[PDB]
Structure 1
Amino acid sequence: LSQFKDETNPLSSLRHKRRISALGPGGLTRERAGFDVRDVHRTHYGRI
């Protein structure tokens, strides 16, 4: 979850700080994640 900062331009780092990952320790692996988790939920409206 600690990543090398992406600072090609201000928007890059700005976006990087606002990103949300389902991976990492205490979370999904890539094989664990099926359709249910990657899908766009109706509740994502205004949030994700």
Structure 2
Amino acid sequence: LSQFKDETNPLSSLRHKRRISALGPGGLTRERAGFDVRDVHRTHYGRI
């Protein structure tokens, strides 16, 4: 999560700030990654 700050444009910096993720130490792995960590639930509506 200690990511390189990107400044290709102000929008790049802003979107990089507003980016959220589901991985990390304590996140998940790509190995057992199914589709539940990939599809969009109906509760994402207006939420993500």
State the TM bucket, normalised to the shorter chain.
0.7 to 0.9
Higher strand share: 2
Q: Which runs of 5+ in 1 are unaligned?
A: none
CA shift for structure 1 position 33 = 1.8
Q: TM-score, normalised by structure 1?
A: 0.87
Deviation per CA, 1:6-47: give whole Å up to 9, x if none.
Answer: 110000010011111111111101113211111011011111
Percent identical: 100
Which 4+ residue blocks in structure 1 deviate beyond 6 angstroms? none
**Aligned residues: CA RMSD:** 0.9
Q: How many matched pairs?
A: 48
Structure 2, unaligned stretches of length 5 or more?
Answer: none
Higher relative contact order (CA 8 A, sep 6+): 1
Q: Distance in 1 between matches of 2:9 and 2:36?
A: 34
